[PDB]
Structure 1
């Protein structure tokens, strides 16, 4: 079962999403059912390390240009049933010709800020709906490449703390 891999991405997307609500002080457990830490694991904690991995890199993106991570509902029409139009579009020009772990991490954070934006306008129906879209995107679209690249596990190794670290060390500047 290859599609099963989603099991890790599902919580990935649900976890990351919640991580975003935290910044805005949003009860992520009032939309889906984010019980708590520890979500299945028959080997060790792959998905766990995978989640954090995306969190780190995702921080690098937001820190780079939070501008893009601003009010998105004010620009386009975000409503239950129309949100699909946007996603399909954004996702199109986003992963048109190229994916890589890079676009992946940014993709997770993408829906993150977009979620808090919707819920803020009394529109949570798009929240969960988006979370599933982000995950299924892999099982449906971002799949053959995920494995070919070396499986979600490979991602962890490539963009692991070691990766995001170097970049932050040679980009953040610090001074």
Structure 2
């Protein structure tokens, strides 16, 4: 069978996380140490598309929304006290109007943003904790909706273009016929 969503959540936040960490030079394998097998050329499949959309989303979403969670992040001060309580409290606030594809892109970049920042200073020990909270939220606190709408394949085929348009141009005045009369 396909048995999707079998384990594309725990390593979903870590995959995008490293994508933003390597940009700063923090890496991830060195975050909490842990033995390092190797992974030279295992291949396996590496044919995931969600990581692609979530990638551009972190950029596109960070343009039209000059102010998205400017208050949410400010309400997540990192410290030896809160963690999943305040994180879920402000996070649930995002998944309240209605679980949507964009909402899933905002909660994703929002989490990686908390790790890239906590690690940007000198705290690479609470990265698995934050990434874990987002991993569980997607494990069974959102998946049921990801498929009810269509599934990750839709989250990309719907917005994440994949050379499927086969139109190239598309402009032509305004890709429309001014139906508004």
Q: Same fold (TM over 0.5)?
A: yes
In structure 1, the partner of 2:179 is: none
CA shift for structure 1 position 44 = 8.6
CA shift for structure 1 position 14 = 0.9
**Does the CA contact (< 8 Å) of 2:16 and 2:51 recur in 1?**
yes
What RMSD over aligned residues (CA atoms) do the two structures have, in Å?
A: 5.1
Q: 1:95 to 1:127 in 2, by over 3 A?
A: same
State the number of aligned residues. Answer: 175
Which structure's residues are more often helix, by fraction? 1
**Does the CA contact (< 8 Å) of 2:84 and 2:133 recur in 1?**
no
Q: 1:36 to 1:78 in 2, by over 3 A?
A: same
Greater Cα shift, 156-165 or 146-155: 156-165
- In structure 2, the gaps of 5 or more residues are 176-181
CA shift for structure 1 position 165 = 10
**Does the CA contact (< 8 Å) of 1:13 and 1:134 recur in 2?**
yes
- In structure 1, the gaps of 5 or more residues are none
Q: 1:100 to 1:70 in 2, by over 3 A?
A: closer
Greater Cα shift, 68-77 or 127-136: 68-77
CA shift for structure 1 position 122 = 2.8
CA shift for structure 1 position 111 = 0.9
CA shift for structure 1 position 123 = 2.3
Structure with higher Rg: it is 2
Normalising to structure 1: TM-score of the pair? 0.72
